Design a protein around this ligand. Sequence first.
Ligand SMILES: C[C@]12CCc3c(ccc4cc(O)ccc34)[C@@H]1CCC2=O
Ligand SMILES: C[C@]12CCc3c(ccc4cc(O)ccc34)[C@@H]1CCC2=O
Lengths: 129, 129
Amino acid sequence: NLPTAQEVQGLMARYIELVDVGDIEAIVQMYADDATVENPFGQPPIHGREQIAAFYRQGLGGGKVRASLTGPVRASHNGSGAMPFRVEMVWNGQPSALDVIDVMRFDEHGRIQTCQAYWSEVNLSVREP
Amino acid sequence: NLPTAQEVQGLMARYIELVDVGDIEAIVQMYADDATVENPFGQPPIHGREQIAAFYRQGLGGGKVRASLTGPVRASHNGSGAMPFRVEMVWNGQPSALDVIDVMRFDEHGRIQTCQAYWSEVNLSVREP
Ligand SMILES: C[C@]12CCc3c(ccc4cc(O)ccc34)[C@@H]1CCC2=O
Ligand SMILES: C[C@]12CCc3c(ccc4cc(O)ccc34)[C@@H]1CCC2=O
């Protein structure tokens, strides 16, 4: 059934753990086979597990990327949620941090149907070595 | 024109200041005249400045309510943003704090076209006397 608010908190928190260790296959499992991803929100969408896998492959492949929740997962009672987190990454050759909020909607099986990532240059912080 | 990422950060931050002081008129001023509010997200949307005003009147009238940002506004390049904040209020006769994330979309006039408040009881915390 459509995930309860508690279940949403659990799923979304796990997603971040998966990102943090680059478990691309487990991430793909979390998504519905016809999921949509808009990251960053504002840019053209990608659809389907094949593309989504490709997107995560290039985002989390190669460069060393970390991710951790910086605040509680906000969860609705209609199978959606939103979470604030921080992504650590190398940007323009240097260690940087990016503040992001993800919004996700889940289907009746508990798979991610939709994911939108809110961030831009204004949320980017280069970290003086 | 459509608010830049930096303007979105400023608009959304100002919105919170206006909720905090309960300036209903100034809050509705920020909305586009055919805007929609979904709060809690999941609940049927309310449409139009008149219905929106009534919502804020009943939400911010009577009981004492404060709000403040708990992190940076995340902003995209299509006039959209998301923000984490905390709402302080009396819930069931007892002072409580609610963690919320609002998603907003602005129009070409810098007015709010859509507002979606992600929160539920899982994000509610009763303060102990
Ligand atoms: C893609 C990325 C690494 C991972 C990542 C970014 C931004 C938003 C994200 C949102 C997610 O839900 C999961 C991963 C990312 C970074 C932006 C630039 C960078 O290299
Ligand atoms: C409405 C409310 C006080 C204000 C408020 C709540 C929830 C989400 C909000 C989102 C906003 O963008 C502005 C104000 C609120 C609380 C939930 C219960 C309560 O009384």
